[PDB]
């Protein structure tokens, strides 16, 4: 009573001969990465991603957002290469890297992240909380134009809202201040 | 003339008591045995005699996942490092999928 396997075996693509010539696992991190990469491949037997409920991940949704602008990637890449080459010529940066003491500004990197891959992180955080599942019922979009809203409570600080902040009702009793970049010739509709 | 002695052993009654499909509550022992045959997975704890018991109420499932040994166990460390580039283990794991929630919201008063 022996049944044939319903697919390729995980330890069948290699040969059992000439094992002394093959490169063995010299460390454990490589084996851990191999295991965590093989665990993501869809198998034909009973796996973990089947019984604990995955809400059917293999399912293409519908994008209802704005298309990305047409930007030449080769020009941006060569400009970034020239920039990092001009920055590498400095000796003070080398000394700061050798002395293990080199700090970077937070506002600049925050603005650059919001201008670049900001919308992608905002979309993934919105889909993590299940916003597109309850609002548009599966349909998702990407916020291209950035949005900035800050409440007004005391007299010096502020109460901002980002992608998952925490605002108390006592600090949101009045209408906040919404600020976003826009051109002269387009209307907007705010919904809360 | 009767040289052997001590071969009058008994059965340990070790085996699987709950198969896949039975409604197992919290605390029921899945299977007692020696040596790690069915490694625990989700909501399945262990003891001192290498036993298996459930932690939540639901349906017990038996799947086969990857086996990632602990770095402190040097025996498993060398057993893994002695493997060629592209060798996996894949042992049998026991999982308990929960069905009933751990609580809900209910109205009490109205002031």
């Amino acid at each position: 009573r022996r049944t044939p396997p319903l697919g390729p075996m995980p330890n069948s693509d290699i040969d059992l001969s000439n094992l002394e010539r093959l490169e063995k696992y010299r460390s454990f991190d490589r084996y851990r990465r191999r295991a965590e990469q093989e665990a993501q491949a869809p198998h034909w037997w009973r796996t973990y991603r089947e019984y604990f409920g995955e809400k059917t991940d293999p399912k293409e949704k519908i994008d209802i957002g704005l298309p990305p602008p047409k930007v030449s990637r080769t020009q941006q890449l060569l400009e970034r290469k020239q920039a990092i080459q001009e920055l590498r010529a400095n000796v003070e940066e080398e000394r700061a890297a050798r002395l293990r003491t080199a700090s970077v500004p937070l506002d600049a990197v925050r603005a650059e992240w919001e201008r670049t891959c900001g919308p992608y992180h905002k979309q993934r955080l919105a889909e993590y909380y299940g916003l597109y599942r309850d609002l548009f019922h599966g349909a998702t979009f990407v916020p291209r134009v950035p949005l900035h809203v800050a409440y007004a409570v005391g007299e010096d600080d502020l109460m901002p809202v980002y992608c998952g902040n925490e605002v108390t009702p006592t600090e949101a009793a009045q209408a906040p201040e919404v600020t976003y970049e826009a051109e002269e010739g387009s209307l907007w509709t705010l919904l809360l | 003339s009767s040289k052997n002695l001590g071969g009058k052993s008994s059965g340990r009654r070790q085996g699987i008591k709950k198969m896949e499909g039975h409604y197992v509550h919290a605390g029921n022992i899945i299977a007692t045995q020696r040596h790690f045959r069915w490694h625990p997975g989700a909501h399945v704890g262990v003891g001192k005699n290498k036993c298996l018991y459930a932690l939540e109420e639901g349906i017990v499932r038996y799947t086969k996942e990857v086996y990632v040994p602990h770095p402190r166990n040097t025996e498993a460390v060398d057993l893994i490092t002695r493997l060629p580039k592209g060798a996996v283990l894949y042992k049998t794991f026991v999982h308990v999928v929960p069905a009933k929630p751990e609580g809900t919201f209910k109205l009490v008063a109205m002031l």
Binding site: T3, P4, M9, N11, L19, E20 | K64, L79
Partner: peptide, 18 residues
């Protein structure tokens, strides 16, 4: 199990010679 198609999946000593 021996009769199930997933038989012999946990074998590991056949890939080593030490």
């Amino acid at each position: 199990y021996k009769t199930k198609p997933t038989h012999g999946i946990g074998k590991y000593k056949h890939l080593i010679k030490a």
